[PDB]
Amino acid sequence: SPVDGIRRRLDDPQVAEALNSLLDHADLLAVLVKGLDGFVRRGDD
Amino acid sequence: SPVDGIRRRLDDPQVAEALNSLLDHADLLAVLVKGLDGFVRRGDD
Amino acid sequence: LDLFVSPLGRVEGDLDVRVTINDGVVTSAWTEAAMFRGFEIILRGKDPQAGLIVCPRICGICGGSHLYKSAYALDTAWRTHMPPNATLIRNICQACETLQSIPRYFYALFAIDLTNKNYAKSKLYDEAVRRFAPYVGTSYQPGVVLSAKPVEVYAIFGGQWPXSSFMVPGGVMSAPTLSDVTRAIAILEHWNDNWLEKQWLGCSVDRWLENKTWNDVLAWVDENESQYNSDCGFFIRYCLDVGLDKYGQGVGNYLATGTYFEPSLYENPTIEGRNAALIGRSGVFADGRYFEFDQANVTEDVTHSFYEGNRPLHPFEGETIPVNPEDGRRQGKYSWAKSPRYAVPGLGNVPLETGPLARRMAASAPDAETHQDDDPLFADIYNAIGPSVMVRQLARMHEGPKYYKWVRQWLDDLELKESFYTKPVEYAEGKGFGSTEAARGALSDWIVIEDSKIKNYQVVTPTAWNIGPRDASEVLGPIEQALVGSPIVDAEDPVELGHVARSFDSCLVCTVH
Amino acid sequence: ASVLWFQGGACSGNTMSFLNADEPNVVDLIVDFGLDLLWHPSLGLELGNNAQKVFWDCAKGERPLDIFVFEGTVIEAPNGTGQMDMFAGRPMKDWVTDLAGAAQIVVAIGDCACFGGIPAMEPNPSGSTGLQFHKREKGGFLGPDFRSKMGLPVINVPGCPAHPDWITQILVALATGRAGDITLDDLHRPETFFKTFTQTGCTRVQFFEYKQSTLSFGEGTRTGCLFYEFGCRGPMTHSPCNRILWNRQSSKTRAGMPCLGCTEPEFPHFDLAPGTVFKTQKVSGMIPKEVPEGTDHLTYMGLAAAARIAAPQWSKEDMFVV
Amino acid sequence: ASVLWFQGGACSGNTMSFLNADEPNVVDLIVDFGLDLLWHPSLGLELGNNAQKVFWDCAKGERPLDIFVFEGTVIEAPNGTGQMDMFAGRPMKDWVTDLAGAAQIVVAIGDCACFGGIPAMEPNPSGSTGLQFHKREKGGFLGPDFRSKMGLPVINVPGCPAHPDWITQILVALATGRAGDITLDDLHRPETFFKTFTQTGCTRVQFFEYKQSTLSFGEGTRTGCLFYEFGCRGPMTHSPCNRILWNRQSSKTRAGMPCLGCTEPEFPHFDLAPGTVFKTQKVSGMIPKEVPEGTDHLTYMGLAAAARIAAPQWSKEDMFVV
């Protein structure tokens, strides 16, 4: 199954480490996308 | 299991909050990637 | 005496021949194709055009033929349009590959056996050795060396030979330039002058093609010293002296699927319109009678082949499911060759010999259209002396002048400003039949495209026709019956088995694919 | 220098290509360069027991074996028995074992022998593998650590088939005392032929430089490079196909056929899966999935846009005109 | 088809190149393609009055003259008398007048005949000119409006010398009924050979694309393109030198020699003035004075900078390795 192969990659130490580090800074990603959303909804202004 | 390592990281209030805010603006992410896809398929033009 | 000859080389692949010998004569024969690659298995599920890449790799010497028929299989499956130039280029390249095969096979694969010690008593033996000894023969070296020229023409149009895939549904990939055509003409004329006419014939191609009867051929041999001492004249005299005209008769029934479409008649390839469009006519010659070739009559039997199966299968429903040769031999199977049979009315599913002789017999059929090969020579030879190693070889060699003339004319026919390719619709579904006459005979692809993938891909090669084992009725394949009756002077070097198998120009990589 | 040329899961295309040799031609190579061709299934005179006598003498060391050329795959099916390739009374793989162990030099000619090639395409019914490679993975049938008696690994002359010069010039080099001039790349290919790319000398590189695509076959190939629409692997394929022309005439790419990357161990690439034959797989319809060797998608695409902007008019017109 | 091949201010290089013809070779062209070579100074049997009889019969129309090939320049010095080229009792230019007026087709082979070539280099002591061109300027000796009896202008097969195929394939085309397939460019060169550039098929175009320069001759030419440091005119020169290889082997550029643009009417370019031989003239030491055909210095240089920055590693290493 392809989906099961992505779950297999998610069981790889290095992939897991990177995904964990992404989740650690997910707040920064969230804030940058929120900032972009804000900038977009104020693009007329 | 590293996939359950990140399932437990998905039980983190702050990580959950950021992931929820990302899913709130997923439409903007989708549209920017669609815009990039469009720009790429019109890159010859 | 049960004699197992392994390997019987110079058959482009892995062949073993088992023979029962009684009183110095083969009384029964088994041809054992010993090497399996399973390209039909590999092609399943691949891109619909994967055949254009894979099928040439069935065989080095006749891959261009594979390409030709695979391309036409796609053309029919996809109902493509073939611009006349594309048809011409395909014809030219198919014929050029055959023109390469003719001397390359004759000198490198066949004629060196003419130096066998069994012929040491022949008055022509010293000359045979001088001419045809491997690598040093005075006919061997120029024949083999010049055999590369026609495939230089092939490479001009296809990029390379072997292993181009430039024949695609809708035409050819290439766009010949003026210098391409002029160089192809120059190469062909040089090869014709230097090997075909100077060495093989000792006369012009036109003079050879004037031979309409066996008596014409004998008169041609005796006509002058040039023809007498030509490789062709010497070969005929050697065959008559050493008895190559006396065995290797075979089935006496022939299959030609034909090839070389008249460009105006096959612009929209279909299975049904194929026969009428052929220049090198199709035709089945069975029980002394001419029949129209119909691919629907083609079955493949695996009773004595190393494949699972219980009934002959038309290749559109063909299957290639190998069985382990140990188990298969326990079941009486002895060859990786399938047993192609042809349903001839009043005869059932019979073996048919394929090859140049089959083509010449087909060319002797009545009611040839203007574009079609109409040649009574081998009807006359068949009626006069019948098939044999010599007659089979002479058919092969006779194609040299004929195909050279056709290629020269096709090169003249190229309209360089016109299209070489009509972009086809790559239909997700389709059933294609592509056939050609490779150097060794009827080569055919039955392809079934489903869901934009190869659903089925069945190749039936000429040597599979010739060398394929006994069918369910235990009827020997053409090469097996040709081996039967062959004298065996020396069981330690049973060169006559080689003469018979190689007179078919057997290609075992093609046989099995 | 004795040469024993065996064919396993071969189509004999390497032999036929080899027979197209010029300078030297095959006869002059066999006779006049001191290369004693002991046997070749397509050319050897001996059959049956005489041929087997030659083979057994080579295998057991009764007579020297300087060069063992192997063409075709090492067929191991069924079940590792190799009986889908029975030759001269043995599975061909057993002959390969013995003769590769006996030879001074082992040359795998053609992808089948080098890497497994087309027969090794899935599902690989014949259990085919190369002599020292299975596709890119080193080891093949003989193992990664196999060395011939001259210390060399299997010399991989890839291609499907190999060009005659790729083998004949190596044989001449061996015969003329220039074996030491032969350097092999990481795939054991002669670097004298395989440092260049197929693209090297391609008549369409100027179109490539300016990102002008051939759009269609036939007359459409009077212009353009085949990389963008026909999956040309020229820039990702090491070969001298456009340096040393095929049949002394042409090359696939010159003729308008995309290079299928046949000198590369992955050939046939993508196993000819649907949509990969004579097509360039693209991301978002415009970025090729595979960019030329040594480039990255970012730089390659930036330079491609710049080149498209800078492209001169002639690069947009037919050039291989009648 | 009768052919009369005359040499004016020639070095016979076009004849020698022609004699290198393969497919067809020269003998097969002369014999087997129905081209009756009436005379050739390097090959004709007749001498003296017998040769002059042949020439006069061609000039006066006593016998048909289908193709008049002229090699070498039309020498007009001294003082327009042409006596620096006396042939068979006349100034060669007078023979040219008569025979060009008599021929069905006139073919100038080699730059000398096409455009004046090397002898027309200043100070042009021989008063050399081409048949229908003096360098790029149309008209040469015969005038811009000269047409042979088949209506064609002088067919210019340039080069110094012309490659044998450039003439032999034209002769084959004429002999095989494909004269109508022959299209001529603005310099009357066969477009089947002169739509491509020398660069077309050059083994160094990838280096050109990535602006990787050959830095030195000899082993330095194992890498790089010769355009930047050696004045390669490949990208400004129409020729099939890298498509149809010289001597079926190579080309200047492949071998490491810059294309001197010899198929171009200005050859030798810059009249070999000091500093222009095997050197790229540059502005401010970085910008080539001449950019490839159809390009502009600003887009070329911009693309060149982009290509340099995105250059792969292999483009910066030897590729034509031993």
Ligand code: FCO
């Ligand atoms: N010729 C040939 Fe090969 C065989 N048999 C095919 O088709």
Ligand code: F3S
């Ligand atoms: S030419 Fe044939 S032997 Fe293998 S390398 Fe290609 S399938």
Ligand code: F3S
């Ligand atoms: S330059 Fe040539 S090698 Fe292929 S990628 Fe373009 S056709």
Ligand code: F3S
């Ligand atoms: S497919 Fe192979 S023969 Fe050359 S042109 Fe490509 S490396």
Ligand code: F3S
């Ligand atoms: S080769 Fe000689 S004849 Fe003139 S064109 Fe060059 S100097």
Ligand code: F3S
């Ligand atoms: S690509 Fe070749 S033609 Fe000259 S400009 Fe460079 S060496």
Ligand code: F3S
């Ligand atoms: S100097 Fe002339 S011969 Fe060709 S490589 Fe340049 S156009």
Ligand SMILES: [Mg+2]
């Ligand atoms: Mg089959």
Ligand code: 3NI
């Ligand atoms: Ni074959």
